[PDB]
Amino acid sequence: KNIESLFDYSAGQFEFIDHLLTMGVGVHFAALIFFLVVSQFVAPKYRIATALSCIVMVSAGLILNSQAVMWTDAYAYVDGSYQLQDLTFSNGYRYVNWMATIPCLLLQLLIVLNLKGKELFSTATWLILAAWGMIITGYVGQLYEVDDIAQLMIWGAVSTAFFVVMNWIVGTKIFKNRATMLGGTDSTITKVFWLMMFAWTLYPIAYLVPAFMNNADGVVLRQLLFTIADISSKVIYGLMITYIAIQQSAAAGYVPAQQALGRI
Ligand SMILES: *C/C=C(C)/C=C/C=C(C)/C=C/C1=C(C)CCCC1(C)C
Ligand SMILES: CCCCCCCC/C=C\CCCCCCCC(=O)O
Ligand SMILES: [Cl-]
Ligand SMILES: [Cl-]
């Protein structure tokens, strides 16, 4: 049901996609160790924001690892090209993983925005419901990326509605709570918003690839877009969230944070 299954791949195409996924694994698990070691310099009220980056690194790293092995399982070099065998490859498992990873990305944002208690629980709940609506409708949509492009487009429009509303909740909370933030991170959090708008928008572009580039090179392009998007939305994002957490920790008087920033 996926466009990947439609084509044979050149050695170059096949190996490049393998390398993209493998590099993806390496970057996320390398970042994992960084987040782990810097977590001790985060104040208790923000430390979970850095823990969530560890959780996202392993979750994302595992899905990329799984995709890479699925890729090599599904294709074998036969008569001069990589051809589909008995096992299958699908990006559908990425969508399932987003059900977990996107709530984690959203939660760590709410934490460094200094949301607490009732507002935190209510905002997270609405955000996660919007996100799940987006992911589920998008998942249904990509079931038709070969059979019914029109249906892909309509489910995509519904998903985009959830996306836009989710982004509005995010922006509203960011620009409202920006003033509460310490150590100059009121400025930093503004860049985080724009990073999210940029990086998360790469995913619907990848979703539309079967509509505007239904060939083997389109398959490469989509994996390339996912790679840019994953690294930006999880790793670069996580680094900014952790920076914000440490900076606010230091400004709040947490001595390990002050000491850590002092060494650099
Ligand atoms: C780490 C993974 C992330 C941040 C994934 C984000 C995914 C999206 C923003 C997906 C958006 C979609 C649309 C807005 C329309 C087409 C269907 C989706 C689900 C690909
Ligand atoms: C934050 C951005 C992270 C970027 C990650 C992607 C790094 C590698 C990017 C690709 C370089 C272009 C490779 C040339 C493609 C050759 C075409 C092919 O062989 O199929
Ligand atoms: Cl604290
Ligand atoms: Cl993920």
Side-chain angles (χ1 to χ4, degrees):
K1 303 300 178 181
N2 55 319
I3 65 165
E4 284 82 11
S5 66
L6 302 179
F7 317 108
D8 301 333
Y9 299 91
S10 64
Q13 286 166 333
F14 178 82
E15 289 174 13
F16 182 56
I17 286 175
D18 189 39
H19 293 159
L20 280 179
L21 297 171
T22 302
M23 178 195 66
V25 176
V27 171
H28 285 79
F29 277 98
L32 165 69
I33 305 308
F34 176 83
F35 292 124
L36 172 63
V37 301
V38 171
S39 60
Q40 62 191 298
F41 308 121
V42 187
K45 68 168 298 179
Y46 302 117
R47 198 170 297 139
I48 176 179
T50 297
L52 280 167
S53 275
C54 291
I55 290 176
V56 168
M57 289 310 103
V58 56
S59 182
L62 283 176
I63 194 63
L64 295 179
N65 181 69
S66 176
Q67 291 296 100
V69 182
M70 276 172 43
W71 184 242
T72 56
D73 277 351
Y75 293 88
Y77 193 78
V78 172
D79 297 337
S81 71
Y82 281 93
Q83 307 193 42
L84 190 65
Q85 298 300 294
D86 300 327
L87 295 176
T88 58
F89 180 89
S90 178
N91 294 286
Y93 292 103
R94 281 185 181 266
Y95 288 71
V96 177
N97 205 249
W98 295 343
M99 299 290 293
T101 50
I102 291 185
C104 288
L105 295 169
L106 294 169
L107 183 54
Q108 58 183 169
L109 171 67
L110 298 190
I111 294 159
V112 294
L113 284 177
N114 301 304
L115 292 191
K116 299 177 182 63
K118 185 86 182 66
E119 184 179 7
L120 175 63
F121 175 82
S122 61
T123 303
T125 298
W126 286 111
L127 271 176
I128 289 167
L129 288 175
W132 282 352
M134 176 186 72
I135 298 163
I136 294 170
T137 50
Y139 170 81
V140 175
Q142 58 88 45
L143 298 176
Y144 297 96
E145 72 179 30
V146 172
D147 299 343
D148 195 346
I149 286 295
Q151 180 145 195
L152 172 104
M153 286 170 175
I154 303 310
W155 283 108
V158 176
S159 184
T160 296
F162 282 105
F163 180 53
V164 168
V165 168
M166 180 187 59
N167 289 341
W168 164 80
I169 297 175
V170 168
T172 296
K173 292 303 178 184
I174 285 183
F175 290 108
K176 174 191 174 182
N177 289 275
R178 173 169 59 176
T180 82
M181 300 183 66
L182 320 164
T185 64
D186 62 307
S187 168
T188 319
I189 196 65
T190 301
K191 278 96 245 188
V192 169
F193 168 80
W194 285 106
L195 171 63
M196 295 175 71
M197 299 302 101
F198 150 67
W200 293 38
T201 296
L202 297 175
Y203 292 97
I205 296 177
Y207 171 97
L208 287 171
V209 162
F212 67 84
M213 195 176 297
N214 190 17
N215 52 53
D217 292 312
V219 170
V220 175
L221 173 58
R222 174 151 75 181
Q223 293 308 308
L224 192 70
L225 289 170
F226 280 152
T227 301
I228 302 164
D230 287 339
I231 293 177
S232 299
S233 68
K234 307 180 203 294
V235 183
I236 297 179
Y237 175 82
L239 289 169
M240 295 192 66
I241 294 293
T242 289
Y243 169 79
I244 289 177
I246 301 270
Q247 189 68 33
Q248 285 193 105
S249 293
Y254 190 59
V255 167
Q258 299 179 341
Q259 290 173 333
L261 293 177
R263 309 185 197 106
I264 67 180

